[PDB]
Every structure is written in structure tokens, then in C-alpha cells.
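Hello,

I think I submitted the chloride ion job twice by accident. Can you confirm which output corresponds to this input? Input:
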Amino acid sequence: HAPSYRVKRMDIAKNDEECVVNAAAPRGLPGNGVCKAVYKKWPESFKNSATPVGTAKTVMCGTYPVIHAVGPNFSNYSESEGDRELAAAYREVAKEVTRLGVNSVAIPLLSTGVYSGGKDRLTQSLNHLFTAMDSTDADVVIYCRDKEWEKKISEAIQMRT
Ligand SMILES: [Cl-]
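Support: Only one job matched these inputs. Its output is below.
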């Protein structure tokens, strides 16, 4: 037992962890990017998966848990309301990870990309991720796709040890 954070630049649908967090689209839809990859790999986990912005809902695919976390779309939310809902989504992820009793979890950065409102939200989203997941016992593996983001996430991980 020595919980860590790691970052990998690859498709989260190929993760090596005991459960996955989906950067879920609202309304339980297949979405794009990460959510679409999750839909292609674990389509059964989208049965009644819809959950409001700021929340998370776990649906099993077989016995593999998919934690659907709906971050805010900053094109629709103000900066202050969106920040609150982004923090809350990660808090509900940490609660689901705890309830599931998993030893590890694969997580993407919520409210980035098409939900970012055209702004770079790495630091904002990653810091809410740390605040929530620091409360758990699980190994956390953060998944990104951009090479400069991998570098920055790795630097943030390094300066917490
Ligand atoms: Cl990325």
C-alpha cells in the first residue's frame, strides 16, 4: 500500500486499472472524444447512465465499473458556477471510487476539450482532481492525449512528493 498518481498519454479505453472514470457527456449520450471511446469499449455501461452536471453515476460493464462523471460545459456555465460543478463532479468520483473499494482508477481531466469553453483548463481541472482523489486510498492513473499536457501533469505530480 503506497497510493500514487501517474499520468499516461494514451486512450483511457485501454487502461490497466480496476475501474474507469468517463468524461461523460450529458444526457447519457455517446458524446465525442473520451466519452465516445468509453462508449465503444463499454457500451453496456451506458444503460441508464445519464446523471446531472456536477455528479457521477457508476454503471457496471460485466463486473468492470464505469464511473460516469459529468463535468460542466464552460460554454454554458459561468466561470464561478462551472468551477463549483467541476469541483463537485470530482468529489462524487472520489466517493464512487471509495464505495467500489477499488485499488486503482483510470481518470481523464474533466471539462477540458469540447467542454472547456475554448480555454486551457489543465491546471484548474487537475487541481480539483487532486483535491478529491487525495481523499482516497486508490492508485490514480490520469490519462491525456496531448504531449505538452502529459509533461505538465507529470510535473504537477512530481511536486507533490
Ligand atoms: Cl489531453
